[PDB]
Each structure stands twice: as C-alpha cells, then as structure tokens.
Amino acid sequence: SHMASMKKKGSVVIVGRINLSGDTAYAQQTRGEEGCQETSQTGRDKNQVEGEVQIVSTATQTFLATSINGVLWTVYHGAGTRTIASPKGPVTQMYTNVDKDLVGWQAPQGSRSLTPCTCGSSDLYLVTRHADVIPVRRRGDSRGSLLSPRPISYLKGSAGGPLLCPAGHAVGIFRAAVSTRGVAKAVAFIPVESLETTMR
Ligand SMILES: CC(C)(C)OC(=O)N[C@H]1CCCCC/C=C\[C@@H]2C[C@@]2(C(=O)NS(=O)(=O)C2CC2)NC(=O)[C@@H]2C[C@@H](OC(=O)n3cc4cccc(F)c4c3)CN2C1=O
Ligand SMILES: [Zn+2]
C-alpha cells in the first residue's frame, strides 16, 4: 500500500470518573469531546486523575477502566492494543490478553487502586458508567446474576468497570452481558485472580 499516508490509532483518553469517595456514587466528566479528540491524537493528557474507576474513550467507543494493584485495567474489545494518553505522551500497554478480553497500563499518577478481594464472598456490586451500583450474586468463577434484571442498554459502555465485594475490594472486571430478549440477567467478568496471574 501507500505507506506514507498510513494512519496511526489514537490513544485511549480518560474523560471522566465514577466518584465513589462519598456516600453517593456519581459520574464526573473531566474532558469534553474536542479536548478528547486532540488528546487522543497527541497522547498528551495533562489533566489531573483521581479515583479508582475512570471513564475512557477512543474515537469510536466509550467504556470504563479500573485501577487494581497499581494497574489501570480495561477490556480488549474497547481498547484493542492502544496506548493511553498521559502527561508525557502515549503509554504502551503493560498487559494485553485477548483471550481474557483484558488490557492494562501502569495506573496514572493521582489514581487510587482497589485492593484485590480475598473475602470469598458471593455478594457483589457492579459499578456502571452511570454510577449505578447494581447488586450481583456471584454464580461461578466468572459469572454473576443481576438481582434485578434490566435492559442491556443500561450496561452498555460499562465494560472495564469493577465488581466489588461488600467491603469494596475488587472481585472482577466486567466484560460481557448475558441476555435474553435484550434483558441482561447475568454478567461475565474477568476474576481478580486472573488479573493477579496475568501480573505474573
Ligand atoms: C461472552 C458471552 C457470554 C457470549 O456474552 C456476550 O458476548 N455478550 C455480549 C452482549 C452484547 C450486548 C451489549 C451488552 C452490554 C454491555 C456489555 C459489557 C459490554 C460493554 O458494555 N461493552 S462496551 O460497550 O463498553 C464496549 C466499548 C467497550 N461488553 C460487550 O458488549 C461484549 C463485547 C463482545 O464480547 C467480546 O468481544 N468478548 C471477547 C471475550 C473474550 C473472553 C471472554 C469474553 F466474555 C469475551 C467477550 C460482545 N459483548 C457482550 O457483552
Ligand atoms: Zn473483599
């Protein structure tokens, strides 16, 4: 092909967060669309990062990314092999596993990391991009059922978000919804143990 005109993929850009610091969970936007587009091109993001759950965007998709053990994790089906924007330019993935639908980068300065759960509890909570905290009963290694099913529309854009135990530890990263007639009855997630193995 004409090699001189081949384009490069933009970086993933942090565009907001899910604030879990207080008694009320809520989404905050930290960058609008024009800034996002420019930042994706340059890979240079000088915005302050805070919190555990980031809202992230590419040119075509928006989803979540969650810091656990000093790594910002998200789904491969959202990020592909993309770099993430940072104050000093694009940062290359430190983990990539298409078979797990998993990617990770070093956690941004200013972020806070969730602690991996060792409670062995099956009472979980899924945090969505709209800051809904959805009770989920763990049903296996990588699945849980919604206590209150809802349309898949409500979950779209939340891949990369956490499933948490009652004590607020990370149990997994949301990757897929299990649905019947458009209603999500269950969720599939990357268990935190699988993240911990990937880190080895
Ligand atoms: C796996 C099973 C049981 C057959 O189910 C499903 O395939 N179901 C569907 C239902 C889709 C309807 C919307 C559901 C709403 C929210 C879904 C959470 C979500 C999302 O919000 N993405 S996103 O908008 O943020 C997006 C911007 C990031 N993910 C998806 O859509 C994913 C993406 C795609 O799956 C994968 O490419 N892989 C690769 C995997 C490798 C290993 C293990 C896996 F499981 C893998 C899943 C299909 N997906 C589903 O969920
Ligand atoms: Zn726990």
Automatic annotation (TrEMBL):
Q: Show the disulfide pairing.
A: 117-119
Query: Locate the Peptidase S29 domain: which residues?
Result: 21-200
Protein location: Host cell membrane; Host cytoplasm, Host perinuclear region; Host endoplasmic reticulum membrane; Host lipid droplet
Q: Which residues bind Zn(2+) 1?
A: 117, 119
Q: Where does Zn(2+) 3 bind?
A: 117, 165
Q: Where does Zn(2+) 2 bind?
A: 117, 119, 165, 169
Question: Self-association or partners: how does it assemble?
Answer: Homodimer. Interacts with host SPCS1; this interaction is essential for viral particle assembly. Interacts with envelope glycoprotein E1. Interacts with envelope glycoprotein E2. Interacts with viroporin p7. Interacts with serine protease/helicase NS3. Part of the replication complex composed of NS2, NS3, NS4A, NS4B, NS5A and the RNA-directed RNA polymerase embedded in an ER-derived membranous web. Part of the viral assembly initiation complex composed of NS2, E1, E2, NS3, NS4A, NS5A and the mature core protein. Forms a heterodimer with envelope glycoprotein E2. Interacts with mature core protein. Interacts with protease NS2. The heterodimer E1/E2 interacts with host CLDN1; this interaction plays a role in viral entry into host cell. Interacts with host SPSB2 (via C-terminus). Part of the viral assembly initiation complex composed of NS2, E1, E2, NS3, NS4A, NS5A and the mature core protein. Interacts with host NEURL3; this interaction prevents E1 binding to glycoprotein E2.
Q: What biological function has been recorded for the protein in this entry?
A: RNA-dependent RNA polymerase that performs primer-template recognition and RNA synthesis during viral replication. Initiates RNA transcription/replication at a flavin adenine dinucleotide (FAD), resulting in a 5'- FAD cap on viral RNAs. In this way, recognition of viral 5' RNA by host pattern recognition receptors can be bypassed, thereby evading activation of antiviral pathways. Cysteine protease required for the proteolytic auto-cleavage between the non-structural proteins NS2 and NS3. The N-terminus of NS3 is required for the function of NS2 protease (active region NS2-3). Promotes the initiation of viral particle assembly by mediating the interaction between structural and non-structural proteins.
Q: What family classification does the UniProt entry report for this protein?
A: Belongs to the hepacivirus polyprotein family.
Q: What is this protein called?
A: Genome polyprotein
Native species: hepatitis C virus genotype 1a
Counting on the full-length protein, the chain here runs from: 1027 to 1688 of 3011
